[PDB]
Structure formats: C-alpha cells, structure tokens
C-alpha cells in the first residue's frame, strides 16, 4: 500500500528510531500496549503503512533492529512502548563493530547479515505494495554503517524497485567524536553514492545550535534531538499517511527533487522551533514559518545555503490553511533571494500540504531543499582522511581487517569526483 | 556476554588487585561473603556484575580474576582477609620462592613452575565465560614475578586465544624514586618481551600518586593503601560502559587500534580527577569544565612524564555521571583551543567520547571526596619516550659495567637478550622519534 | 496602517515606556495576560497601530527594548503587564555605558546595535504602513543616548521616509545628576539636530513642579512622572488611534508645526492637573483647560514662553464638546497675548479634537507649542560644557573612549549655530 | 553578570575583610556555614548574592574574595573561626614570615614568594566569574604586606586584565596617631608604585573612626571591631546598586572617570552617616536633610583632612532606602547653596545621584542605631593634598637622615626609588596644586 519498514543500526540511530516510532505512536494515539485509544479512524485508515495489526489488535511496527551488541536491544527493550514491539526483530550482535567499518562490514559485517536479511525478507512478504523502508545509522563509523552498507547493497539488489531513503549521522567539522571517522565515512560514502536512493544529512552541532539558540535550551542530549529529527522524518510521509489538498510522495519527491541520481544527499528544515515564551511574542502564519524556512540556522546540515546555491528546494506543509497564501510566499521567496536559487531550474521551489498538521500544532512546515553547499563537508572529511592517510594513522587497526588501501583511493577520487561534480552543476548557467 | 578478567602479580600489583575487587564489590554492593544484601530482580537490556562477579546457585558471586605471583606471603592475607568468603581457593595460585627480582628467574627459572596451573585456571574461567572481550592483567616491574612470570604469561596467553584484548596495568619505574636498582634489567628485559605480547597498556607511576594525593587529596602521608585506592578508581571507570548505561558505551576493542593508531607505540597516560577533599568538595563546584580543563593539567598528569613536552594523539575522556554531550563537546573545542598542546597532526582529531551516566561512588575510609562527574583521560602523546630514554641510559651504563649480570646469567638468559633488548628500546625510540615527525609538505 | 513602534533606552526611559504601554493597556482594557476585556470594538478597531494580536489573541506591543545591563530588563520583566510582552525584545547589554556617551556609542555602541537593528527590522517587516516609531532616552548621558544616537542614524538611513519622534530627558539647569552631562548632551544633540524628526523636552524639575505645586504632591518618584508624560505621549496618537471631528496626524502635526526642519524640539502641556479636592473647587470647560494651556507652570520645559515667543502653538483635544467653543477660545487666546505669538505666522495656533477623551476624564487638552525660549537651555548646557572643556574636566574618561575634541567643537559651534538660528527667527518681523 | 571580588592584606586590612563578609553574609542572611536558612525561589529581573556569595550545588555559598598576607597568624583565626564552614581552603593564601613592615620585603624579598599562587587563585575566580566588573582590593600601609605585596599585586593584576575596575580600600597613616615610623617609607614607596597601578581608591583614617564613633556612636572605648564594623557599613552601601534595586543604580566603572575627572588625582573622602545610638535613634528623626546637610559636616568628615580647606569636585551621595529624588535634589541645591564650599568650577556640578531603596540593615552587637536612609559621600576635593605634604616632609627629613634605610637597601631597593618617589609626590603636589587653580578669565 506504499507501506514501509524501518531498519536502524548506529551508535545513536538505534536510539533514534526508538524515539521515532515513539512519536508515530503518539500521532496514532495507540496505547503502549498496542491497541488504539484515539478518536478518529483516520489514524487507523492509513495505520498499516507503518504499523501492523496483530491477532487481537497488537499493533506493531515494521521496524528492523540492527546492532552488534545487545545493550541497545535491552535499552529500547527497556523502552516505554517496549510492549508495543515484536520480540522477533531484536537482531543484534555479540561483539560490536569497534567502529572499524571493515569489522562491521566484513568481519561482523558478513557474520550477522544473513539472519537480518532473512527476517527482513519475511517482512518483505509482509508488505503488499511496499513503497519502501527507512534505514538509519551514522556515516562516520560502523555501529550502523558497518552493516548498513551491506544492507543497502543486499536489499538494493534484492529490491531494485524499492526506495532507500537513508539518514545517517555526519561528523561535524569541529568536534571529532572519533578520528577513524574519515575512513569509515569515506569507505561508506563510496557505497552510498552508488546504492542509496535518498539521503539527508545528520549533524549534531546543528542540533545543538537549534536546541541552544533557537530552542533556547541549555541541556542537550540525544533524545530531544531525535525528537527534533523524527519530527521531520515523521512528517515526510504525512500525505502518504494522510490526505492533502496538495500531495506528493517520496517518488514524487525525489523524482521532483533530484536532477541526476548522485544528488540524494539533502538538507533539512523543520519548524516552528520556540521556547515557551515565544508564542507570547509571536503567532503562526504560513509567511512566518516561511520566514523560518530559508533560515541557515534551521539549515540543520554542515552546508550553507548562504554560501552554496539552492539546486532544489521544497516545503512540506501539514495543517489547514490557504494555499493561496502558500504558493504566494513560495514564489515570493523564490524571487527574494533568487541568487541562491540555481538558474535553469525554473520554479526550483515546489509545494505540498497535508490536511492535518502534526499533533499539538496547527500548521506544519518542512524543508528538504538541496543546494550544493555540502562540498565543504566532503572536502573537509576527505581532507582529514587525506592527512592521516598520508600518515596511515590507525591503518593498523584498519589493514588488520584485511581491506586494501586502493579501496580508500576508490572512495577517495570517487568522493572528490562527486564534489567537483557538484561544482560544475553549481558553476553553470 | 561482555566479560573481562583480571590477573594480579607482583607485590604492589596484587595490592592493586585487592583494592580493586574491594572496590567493585563495594560498588555493586555485594557483600564480602558473596551475597548481595537482597534478592536480584529479573530484568534485561544490559548485563550487570555478571561480567566479573560470578553467579552461583546462591548468594555466592566471586570475581572473574586470578592471582599469580611467586611471593606467596601477602596473598595469604587475602587468604585470611575478610573476603575469605569472597574469593575462591582455585582462584588462588602463588609461588613460594619468588624471583628475588630476577626477571630471568620467575620468567625462566621459576617461570617453568606454575605456568600450567595458571593456564588451566584460565581455561576454567574463559570456558566459564562466553563473550569475554579481553584480559585484565596486573603486575609490576618490581615484585619480580610481576615482570618475569607475567612476561611468559602474556607470551603464551596471547598465543592461546589471541582474539581477546590485552588490558595492561603494570607499574613503571618512577623517574627518580625507585624500589631497587636492577629495575633497568626487570623493565627492559620485560619490554622487548612485553611489546609483541602486549596489545595496549598504561604506565602508572607512583610519585604522581604521592604528589597529587597530597595536594589534591590533601594527603599528608600516603602509601599503597592510597595508591591502590586511586588506581582502584581509575580502573573503576575505565570499564563502566560494560557495566553501566552511558551515552557512548565505548569498548576496549573499540579503543584498541583507534587510540593507538599505529601498532607499535601502544601505551598511554591516564590522569583521572576529580580527586579532592571533603573541605574542597565544599568550597567548590567541580564543573564539567573544571574536570575537563583540569583534565589536561600537565601537573595533574598522573604519570611523571610532561605532556607539554609531548604531542597528544588521542584522548578518551569517558565520563561518569551527569554529563552533557554539548558541554563536554565545547570543552573539547577548548582542547583544540589549547595553543600549548600539539597533536599528531596526521591524526588531526581522534577523540572518542564517553558519557556514562552513573557518577562516581566513593569508598568509605577513603580520602577522595564525592562528586557528580568523572573523567578518564586515557591519552597518548609523544612525550613518554623520554623517561624510557632515562631507563635505557641508566640501564645503559649499569649494564655496561656488567653490574648484577652474574645474577641473570646464572639463571639462563643470554647477553644478546640484553644488547638486543637495548636495540628494542632503540627501535621504539625511533618510533616515538618518527611518529612525532610531522609529515612533510 | 500608520501603526508605529517603540524603542527605549535611558536610565529612566526604559522605565518610562514601561509606564507608557501600561497606560495604553488601560486605554485598551486588555488584560495583563494579553486578551481584551473591554466593552467597545473601538479599542480593537485601531488596536493594531500600537499593538499586535498573536496566535490565540496574545496582544502584544510593538516596542523595542534598549539597555546595556539587564537590570531594567528584569525590572520591567518583573513588571505587571509583564505577561503582556514578547520575550523576544529583551535586548540589553552585559556592561552598561557608564554614561560616557562614546562608550555607549562606539564601545558598546558598536557592540550591540546589530542584534537590535535586526530584530527591529523584523518588526519593520511586521509593519504594514508604518507611520513611525517612538524612541526614548535622555539627552545627558549614554544609558539611552549612547546607542539611541546610533539608532537614529541607522534607522534614519534605513527608513528615510519614517517619522522619528524623539523624547529624551533634558538636564535641568539647577540639579546636575551628573557632570559629564554637557558632553554627552552636546555630542548627542549634534546628531539629533540632524537626524531626529520630532523632539520634545524632558525636564525633571518641571515634573517636580507639577507634582508638588499643581499636583500638590509631596512625594515625587519617576513612576508618577512617567504617568504624567505618557499621558501626553499617549494622547498624541488619539485621532490617529480614534475618530475625531478635527483630526491631524504627526505628519499633519509636524508639517503643520515646523517651518524649517531644525525646529523639532517642542515643549509640552497636558492637563487637567488637580489634586482630589480641586473638582470641588472647579469644573471643566474648554475655556478652562485653555486657561491652563498657556500656563508657564504647565510649560513642562526649561524654556519660558513668558520670556521667549511662541513660534508655534497647537492643542490636542480628546473628548466631546463644541468646537464652536474650541476655536473661539483659540483665536481669543491668539489675540490675548499676541506679543508672545510670533508675527508672520498667521493663525500660529492650530486645532484638533478626538471624539473620545482619555479614560477617566471627559475632555482632553494637550499643548505642544514651540516658542524659541529653549535658547537659554542650550546656552546653559553649552556654557557648562564650555567651562569644563576649558578645563577638559573628565576628558580622560572621555578621550579614553578615543573620540576627538574636534567633534566637541562640531557639536559646539554647531549647537551655538542652532541657538543663534533661533535668535534670528525670534528676532525678525 | 555583575561580579566583584575582594582582596585582603595587612593586619588591619583582613580585619576589615572579616568584618565585611560577616556583614554581607548577615545582610543576605545566609547562614555562616554556607546555606541560607531556607530555599531560594527562582526569579529574574536582577542578580542577587551571586555577585559574591558562590553558588554550589547545595547550601554552600562562599564569597568571591581572597586573602593574601605574609603574617599568617591572625588569618588562622578565620581558619578557626565560626565561618570555617563559610570560607574555603583555597580561598586562603598567607605568608609565614611577613614583611616586618619592610615594604621592600614582601614587595621584593617575600614579594617573590606567593605571587603565582595568588594569580592562580585569581584566575580560578575570574574564570569562575563572567561579568566581574572590578576588583575589591584591601590592604594597609601598616601590616606591611598590605603595602609591599599588594603593590606588586595590582602592579601585575592590572597588567593581567586591565579592563576590570580597581576598587581600592587601604588605610592611610593617621595624621598624628600612627603605628610605626617607617610609615613614610611604606606609604610613599607604595604611592609612586601605587598610582599608575591604581584606578581609584579611597583613604580611610582611623582617628576619625575614633572621634566619631565616640561622639556619634557615643562610643566610650573603641577598637578594630568598631572600625572594621564601620568600614563594613560603608562598603556595604558603596555597591548596593549591583545588589539591590535603586532608582539610579550607578556603577563603579560609571564612577570612574566621572568622579575623578582627570586621570591623576583619583582618590577621595567618604563620610557615611547616619551613625547614632539607640538613645539617639529615639530622641531623633534623622531627616533626609539631616543626613544630607550632615553629610557635609567637615567635623563629620571620615578622613582627617578638612574639606573646608579644600574645594569639592564630585559627590556621589548614593542613598539607601526611602529616598525621594526631589527632597535630596533640593538638598543638593542646598549644597550648591553652601557659601563655605567651593568647587572645581570648571566642573561646575558633577553630581550623580544614588537612591537605592533598601534602607540599611544593622549588625547585632553593633553600636550604630537603625535608620531608614543611608548616605555615602564619596567626594573628591582639593583638600587632601596637605596631609600628603606632611607625609613627604616627615619622610623628607627622616629620609634625609637616612633613618632605617639600611633595612630597605638591605632588601633590594635603590635610593633613586626614594628620591624619585619624592618626585612622585612632588608631581601629585603639582596636581592638587594645579587642578585647584581656577581656569583664567
Ligand atoms: Mg613476587
Ligand atoms: Mg602581614
């Protein structure tokens, strides 16, 4: 039915989806137990395309658990809504990748892929007209990417018609949570540029910036952050989940978002984002949220539209309004800062609306535009990879996995090729 | 599922071990006999004690660690001590006549005497265990078996399993303070036979323990009780991830080829804090930034080798308690900020966060005050080669004078072991010499 | 809609506007919470041109907070009606100007202007047909003037069409609340003669005189005083806020008040002003309040119409009466003391009426006439500036800011030029 | 946000400090241990204690001030005293062997000994602080470190931060009453090294404290308890703006180049009132005008230098409590009214009002009676140069006789420091000489 599935690895991402399904449960108001306690059939109408009824009305996720060590499995296993799960999917590891990506990709990569792809495949038979599935990990290591690389390869072959919308955490330029990041990252991204269908960037520092400045929060954790992102990743299917006077699916999205298949790394904007007092400063209009939409500070990725140029831009609106406003602000904005709008893409802004906003708010905005400002991102990470690969720093942890360096060259001149590729598209008219 | 096991050797070494298992048993609060004060509820999500404290069919939960040393007096004190309900007889293997600090004796001479018993015990535990990640081995370049017999120990244990991690805690000859003079012999003879049998290990020196406990713990007159307590804390936190929920429950194997990027120079420093008094617990606040900026005080450096004379490579500031990713994170920016510090630039950043949510527990009768947040700066730099150089120069001359050599030649070692082992520190001097060279252009 | 904004700095002025918006709230009878509890739509009809509805009907000010130290921000932040505010505008400083005006103008002047002019600009987009905005500080220091000088320059350039009606506190001739006043003052007034559109004089001693003699009050504070002035500054927009058989806006006012742009320093009269017993002495007539209108004791400024000559004079009437009276008293008075009426300005008195008086009273009077008696004001302050500038007294606090003295000459022969300028206009026929 | 911090030196000086923090802690009523009697509600609008009392994660709120002096006996009394829960160990830095009132000793000789510890403590606090405006430094030209070591202290601390304000409380040699005879040496050697390291500071003399406490407090037999109490009040009010709501919460930096218009002659008087008895608290009314007119009584002048012999420059009559702008204002007209008073006419008026709404709090066991209104006449005139002249003439002859000079030359100062420092008071004599000249025409 255009239903989809979720698969998460990732040192964080395993938590991320926990929050995610948590949020969707709220938007479906079904008890933690797994039965519905809401007030409209509309939550039940399209419930299946994420959930699954069970005998007795156990309502369940179409999620897939990735992990190389059960702790997360216990963690979310210790999770509220944990009784809303299926014990089947608790597919984890006994070792951990140690985030040498070769470890999580050959060593443990080849070790535990099979049981996953089997049960996942059983989910594939459980899906009537599968629009797709949602993968989640991080692009700097192996706790997610280790195996998730193998996932994208295997299912991608196994389902060359299905959509692969991939969110994985990008290392911020400043803070290096690990120094093996350039290598895991580069080795992964070689794969992901080939095999993944959609990708959107996952920085932490942006999420900090949001929580601290625009959220005006002092205490950052993951969980709030995954609230902030699963807000958007939860919004994305809204029309696909719920009616909309102007609907567009991921196929309409990506096909209406990408000129050439190498450009499915997208940046993200969601809003509104206030602290409590703000409403008693300000109110909500479509033009208002628009005035956030093109905010670099909501630009939750390491790329700057202020520095790069919008190759593409789009808006995901959930609520009840007048599109006569919506479009009007659209075109207005597409003029107002025309210069950061790439040229030969006429009407490079594109529209949407969901008859219902997310719960709690009256109107919704989402922006997954695609400039080319990410070039500094790949340039950076490739740069650090370059330096220590001059040094071969921690190659020994690496070659101990029994990869070659020439692969590193492959993702290397590879990833540079993708960058310059974005250069010419940005530098053209 | 996630096991480790501790090995204990040398007088100071098993002193450390005693402090440690006192500690952990305190920290899970399982009573010294082997029972917990109360029943254990059935739950899931992560392991517990099961790592180390050994489940029985009843309130008997013994460590997963082993004693081995050829100087069996003191260990008997454990054989007598309060935890004589705690430990287990077959947990105990000792030698009667120790090495006399002949490396070559308990390594060669008495090296032959207890090995098989050791390996059998190891097989009993690892066979008892499932997902034992790595090996906690403790010894000392002083209590002589701590050098010699341990040297054979890893020398063979590595060849037994291999795939386990080598968790190395041994003590290093204090720079000017000491215990003997054959220490050169113990150390370097250990080292050339240490390295290729070692995965990674840290070097704890005492004089720092003194100076810092006396200033920072406000200690007037310390000893191995305080020392063993302090290392008790540091190991207490170096493995919390496998014991307690933390945001980034990093792991040893994870640490291995990432902290020590190359294979060779795979040791490090470790300055834990916050060690303060009850009168500094109050009159203070002990910020994340205070532990953090304080974490890199060269004068806080818990092994007598100046960091400021070296260039850092990695820093795994695993944290206990109420830690914020952001706050620490910006502190790490602050660490990038430190002009005086200089990093193996070809490893620009190699950082690796640790935010475990349990703040520290304190041992009654101790001198450390209670806090909310712990740091372990397991960091690796260029600096530490120098004191080695002192070791090989001291040993250089003394060996040149053939001092004591009769003792060792009497027990079955050859001279080329000596000069060649000096070639060993020659090479490692080339290693700290070279890796510190900044890659050209 | 001819809506306007407020911006306040100033050691007092930050309090002043607090009282001001407080008063306007009363005249709009909306709760402190920010919703309307009144009885006529008329309060809601033109509510926007000061206020702003919010999502949910949070009704908010178009105010802008200036400060170099948050205490005032907490103060009014501790203010009744404080829940009627928007937390956004609480734009303050971490230092304080120390009232060296160069400090508040270069040092901290350049330090914090940006965040202000940004958010203010966001208010500029929030304004449909902005008649203007109301600034408030004092003309003797830097707590307001420090930055407010920069405001007038920046927005004046940024909005060369908008009205800048400026009220700032004038040091009384007798009491010197600080001795650096001539210098801050002169340096400011150089700017204000160039850049500000309207100005009205703010003495304290007049307000004392009003409270003590004509109010018959013994206990003076600020807050009552700001009541007395925000009474008038609140009256000014009445027609602009409410119907009037004879209406006139600030454009009609100033254009109908000023012959040449250098003359937008105006004096003020508001009334009635009694203590409680007075009504049981007297009653209200247009001729009565007229008989107060030309009272030097209501002449709330350091200039004397009794000594100077009315270059201009005007009346702001709110109530319900017969203009047949109003004019009649007007012309009557324009004769009665013709000599203090400048000559070649025929009908130098001008009229107005608002269909509603302010709340609580039945009829309203306001007088913002403009004689030229202020010449003694500038002459004084310039004189003290002259003396200690002979001494360079506290130049070291000053040049420590890194200004030049030649600027002091600039505002100096400047301000003298403006004075003599008023001399020739006064001395002419 | 708005921080200041206090520094304490010299016997009388830290006496003052003890009185002070006793005071403030009384006034916010936080109990001596470090807790408030009750919980603190969350609010906004202005700061609180946070200026000085230091927030913990619990009822531990220590001052932001520091002790430094080389005569460590008495400070121990604080180390022993009731507030031994209040203060904090690292708050305490003392020298063992003080200066012996060699300026050159604790300034030069022992000057070298504790400086770095001081600066580290300063970095800990200022790093702990954010919007620290300025520096409260207390010392004495008697308790000899109060001159010497403080002299280096500002000499370097100024060069450290600079942008902070220098809040100078030190005592000045009473005109005819004294403590020693080398006081000339202490003072002037301080002064030439004081000025260019000082921002602004006031001169408290004792004999006024005596005469006025005995007449106005009706005191029979006073000492440093009464004195330290009195300066406790005056500093208690000199900073209320940053602590309490007042109409014109003027600030130090605000005071700086406005009270002391020129850069040079940047000191002043300070006659606080209303100091009266319980039997004069009744039998009186204590008008604003009484405090005000009374504020300018030369016989009330709280430093033994006749105002009537000088010409006033500025007067910051910051007021505690129920003050009226008008009433005081007309009193200031009354001050313009005073024929006997004469002002640096090129600064015709330089007044600067202070109306803080909290009236004063009283310290139990004290002699001052309770009132509703406080005045601080921080005022600057021409008068104060004279007693200086006594200082340089006294010191002039004594130094001419080379008296004691062996003591100082023995510790590493040169003679041109002496004669040149006399040139220093020469210049400042030209300054009070010149600024008092009425500008011509
Ligand atoms: Mg032994
Ligand atoms: Mg002393």
Residue numbers in the entry:
A (entry chain B), C (entry chain B): 1 to 429
B (entry chain C), D (entry chain C): 1 to 441
Extract from the study:
Conserved in both motile and primary cilia, the doublet is the elementary cytoskeleton of the cilium, comprising α- and β-tubulin heterodimers, forming a complete 13-protofilaments (PFs) A-tubule and an incomplete 10-PFs B-tubule. The outstanding stability of the doublet is likely linked to microtubule inner proteins (MIPs), which bind firmly to the inner wall of the doublet microtubule. In this study, we obtain high-resolution structures of multiple repeat units of the doublet by single particle cryo-electron microscopy (cryo-EM), reveal the remarkable interactions at the outer junction, and discover an inner sheath of MIPs inside the doublet. To structurally analyse the doublet, cilia were isolated from Tetrahymena thermophila and split into individual doublets using ATP treatment.
Micrographs of the vitrified doublets were acquired and the density map of the doublet was reconstructed from the 8-nm non-overlapping segments by single particle analysis at 5.7 Å overall resolution. At the outer junction, where the tubulin from the B-tubule attaches to the tubulin from the A-tubule, the M-loop regions of our fitted tubulin models in the PF-B1 stick out from the density map. The M-loop of α-tubulin seems to adopt a different conformation while there is no observed density for the M-loop of β-tubulin. To account for the specific conformation of PF-B1, we performed further real space refinement of our tubulin model in the PF-B1 density. While interactions between tubulins in PFs-A10 and A11 are canonical lateral interactions mediated by the H1′-S2 and H2-S3 loops of tubulin in PF-A10 and the M-loop of the tubulin in PF-A11, the interactions between PF pairs-A10/B1 and A11/B1 are specific to the doublet. Our calculations show that the interfaces between pairs of α- and β- tubulins from PFs-A10 and B1 are relatively large (buried surface area of 688.6 Å2 and 462.1 Å2 for α- and β-tubulins, respectively). The interface between α- and β-tubulins from PFs-A11 and B1 are weaker with buried surface area of 351.7 and 137.5 Å2 for α- and β-tubulins, respectively. Using PDBePISA, an interface prediction server, these interactions are predicted to be mediated by electrostatic interactions involving residues R308 of α-tubulin of PF-B1 to E414 and E417 of PF-A10 and residue R306 of β-tubulin of PF-B1 to E410 of PF-A10. The M-loop of α-tubulin of PF-B1 is also predicted to interact with α-tubulin of PF-A11 through a salt bridge (H283 of PF-B1 to D306 of PF-A11). We also detected salt bridges between α-tubulins from PFs-B1 and A11 after the refinement of the tubulin model in the PF-B1 density. This conformational change in the M-loop of α-tubulin of PF-B1 is likely to be induced by the interactions with the PF-A11.
